[PDB]
Design a protein around this nucleic acid. Structure first.
Ligand SMILES: [Mn+2]
Lengths: 104, 91, 76, 97, 95, 106, 84, 99
DNA sequence: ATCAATATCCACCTGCAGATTCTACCAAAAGTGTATTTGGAAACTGCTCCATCAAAAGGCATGTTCAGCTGAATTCAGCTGAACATGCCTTTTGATGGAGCAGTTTCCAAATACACTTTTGGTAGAATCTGCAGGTGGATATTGAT
DNA sequence: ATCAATATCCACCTGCAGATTCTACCAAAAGTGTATTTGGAAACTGCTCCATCAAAAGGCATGTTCAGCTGAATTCAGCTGAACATGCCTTTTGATGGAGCAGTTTCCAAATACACTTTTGGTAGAATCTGCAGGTGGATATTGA
């Protein structure tokens, strides 16, 4: 009967709703907000996990580490935009070398 | 005490990649991402409310905020899921 | 202390940065900017701790301070 | 004897490091640096071992980044050797100064 | 159907006479002033909320404002800030 | 009789407004009584700082009325105020005159 | 009314010139003009998009100055003098 | 003579001139059309407040003036006195607008 | 462009321990049932403000000429910074132990929150002012040709 | 080494559009009487955080050689600035119609407020497990001949 199952989401809607109340974001929190936010947070996670998987899978590892995540985030143009100001610990940088630096 | 989204991220991870698993550190990175977005979407949402002299945040306020915070396809898909989960929850 | 930041280390940092040739002057210079980074981040960091009244700088204090500086950090 | 032409190892270094994520700066010296700086602001403070990492992670991440920008300025002036002159520009453009 | 929106206009003006009796300010400049006041107002209160929230406090003390000011204001400006406030508060409580 | 709270603290800025705006702002659940004054005082001060530097600019330019230009100049010439308002742009502010060294004749 | 199109060329060369002068630039390459326009067009789009989004949330058919201001603030390009 | 000013001399004169004034360099009517065109594409039949269009024009001009200074410093840095798209593009890259 | 002789990477291989993930259960929340407040959607409709259009006009944007001087190309070489073999010591790391100290309770006196009622302090028109914007002119440079 | 040639500067001028004042209502602080919390304030832990203390081993500091990178100086093709001539269209001014904010009212659909009853998600052990980490053996990438 969890409100989350009703919306069919893995993320805790209750948690989000309780978090919204204690946040001071507003006077009153609509019932639809919690599921919506919670929902939106789920998808985003989904999106990044999937790409890391690939990174992980691509690297030959069955376990995701920060590097996989950074690779995934930075290779994707849109995800980069969203987390441009953020920095992942142990993320390293994508491997890029200027053309001119290469031997001619 | 000391609650984290760690448990939830794992489930989501399993759907997309049953075969794969996530390290402790990477988990932390994921928790941080969830939190930031959460704070970022909620913040804006709050502002939409205030700018409009509203005293309550509708799911709509969460959505409009999502159109400003997320770009292109990320936004589209993001907006859809929210409306979809809401339409289903209410039913 | 700031000299703890050895020249070869700085050279390494630049590599990951994509640099191939480093003037000899950079080092002191790379050292200077670094010193400044911490000064600004820690300062705001401590202020947060002091408001807190704790005598220990949690990993958290740093995070909050980094966000204020715009240099957001994940994983701690 | 065999000697590697100049700049060959450099590129070998670049390729090598970008591949690894470990922090390059020596941990104890840094922590020593951090404590020193922290003391001017407050005395007899204590740091969570984790607190230092955050600090170190941020600095190396920032420093690595500053150099990327530094390079573009050095490349942009027809040079291949980063100079203090380049660093200042990148920072002046960034708004740090 | 009047629709009265308030501004810091009256107050900025009083302060303008304090520093320079002979000088006056224009509409366009006033607007700028109100914005400055409002901007800074949001920074301190918003940044003050964070302090409170970070420390699980349910109330914003005059103290939290101060700590926010230190973080928000740079150098001497910050120092004078704190001084003028504390003065104001100490005077207020003592009355 | 009746006394304004601001007068108690001897400020020109409206403490009642600042306190009420803090309440309605959702910044926190409880707003101490000292905070509104403390804050109100901080802005008053900052306002006087900015007004001060502009005034002179007006006099420097032989104007008895402060216009935006003066504010911009005030804010940009002072190192610290500049910093605080680094990200901001003043409408009609113009820019501090500055020609690059190399660009000059010779 | 009248159909609007290719109004980005409204931003003349002298005007782009003038903007550069105030910027302190003494010499301008010819390719600059068209490049500038490009950047300007992008700036506007991004700021107007948000602006109008704030308008759409309000359901108003008119974009008030505030809309523009709140917009600019999000963009980290805060503006003083119009609505707050 | 005809009296003529050596090249670059007037440019220096313009620089001193426009830096002193605060008026908007771009022509008001054309900007407005541009702003109304772009906005029309996002939402049809929108209406703009006289003050809203100004706001937009102030921020734009400000942005560009600002971009030009940085660009100028990139030109001076590359040893050239002439700004170039190569400069603008770099400047924005460092700014992070589009790395 | 090979030939050849270094030094490098680079898969294929393969062993246990530092992590991961799975278990086994208890306070903290979340979900429910009821009972109330109330926020703001719908329904007018006053009425600024925005869109438009007509007109005259000169501020300026365009195009074209010309040729000054900057950007780009070359060439050279002095010397800065990579590559290195060298010799040595500060960083690692690993417990070990003690204690400064985050983090919990548990009351509670001081400080806030509320709920109503007065009481001014502001804000939005008017009535009155007055810097200064927009011109004019000489004095004062600053430039660029000789 | 000169000097017209032109633009830039500064003070004087003067009605008028943009202040400064001047006033009446009334929205919202201020004053009071209670009804709740709140964050300290002593006591006390269980811990993370300093301190040594102790070996070794990478990792850092150095003095050497010289390869090729940055700067300086020389050139000159032609890109871009300065001037005019032309006449297009952005400005100014003002008039109107009416789309569409916004202030009011009206009141259900929705959110908030407890009193409990349940279920879940964080912890601390308990039972697996992916990689770190070396370790060959073999093209590969460099560089000199
Ligand atoms: Mn169109």
């Amino acid at each position: 009967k969890t409100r989350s199952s009703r919306a069919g989401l893995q993320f805790p809607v209750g948690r989000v709703h309780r978090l919204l109340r204690k946040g001071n974001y507003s006077e009153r929190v609509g019932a639809g907000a919690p599921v919506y936010l919670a929902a939106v947070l789920e998808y985003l996670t989904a999106e990044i996990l999937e790409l890391a998987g690939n990174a992980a899978r691509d690297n030959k590892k069955t376990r995701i580490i920060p590097r996989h995540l950074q690779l995934a985030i930075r290779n994707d143009e849109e995800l980069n935009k969203l987390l441009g100001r953020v920095t992942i610990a142990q993320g390293g940088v994508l491997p890029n070398i200027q053309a001119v630096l290469l031997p001619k | 005490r000391k609650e984290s989204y760690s448990i939830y991220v794992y489930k989501v991870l399993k759907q997309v990649h049953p075969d794969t698993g996530i390290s402790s550190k990477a988990m932390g990175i994921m928790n941080s991402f969830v939190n930031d977005i959460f704070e970022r979407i909620a913040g804006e949402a709050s502002r939409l409310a205030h700018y409009n002299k509203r005293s309550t945040i509708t799911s709509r306020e969460i959505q409009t905020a999502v159109r400003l915070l997320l770009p292109g396809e990320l936004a589209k898909h993001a907006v859809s899921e929210g409306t979809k989960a809401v339409t289903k929850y209410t039913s | 202390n700031i000299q703890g930041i050895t020249k070869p280390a700085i050279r390494r940092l630049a590599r990951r940065g994509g640099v191939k040739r480093i003037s000899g002057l950079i080092y002191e210079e790379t050292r200077g900017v670094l010193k400044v980074f911490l000064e600004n981040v820690i300062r705001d960091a401590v202020t947060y701790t002091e408001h807190a009244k704790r005598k220990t700088v949690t990993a958290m204090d740093v995070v909050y301070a980094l966000k204020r500086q715009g240099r957001t950090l994940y994983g701690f | 004897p065999h000697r590697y032409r100049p700049g060959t190892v450099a590129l070998r270094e670049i390729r090598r490091y970008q591949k690894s994520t470990e922090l390059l700066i020596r941990k104890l010296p840094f922590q020593r640096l951090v404590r020193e700086i922290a003391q001017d602001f407050k005395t007899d403070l204590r740091f969570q071992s984790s607190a230092v990492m955050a600090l170190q992670e941020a600095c190396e991440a920032y420093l690595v980044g500053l150099f990327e920008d530094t390079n573009l300025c050095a490349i942009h002036a027809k040079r291949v050797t980063i100079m203090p002159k380049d660093i200042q520009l990148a920072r002046r453009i960034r708004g740090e100064r």
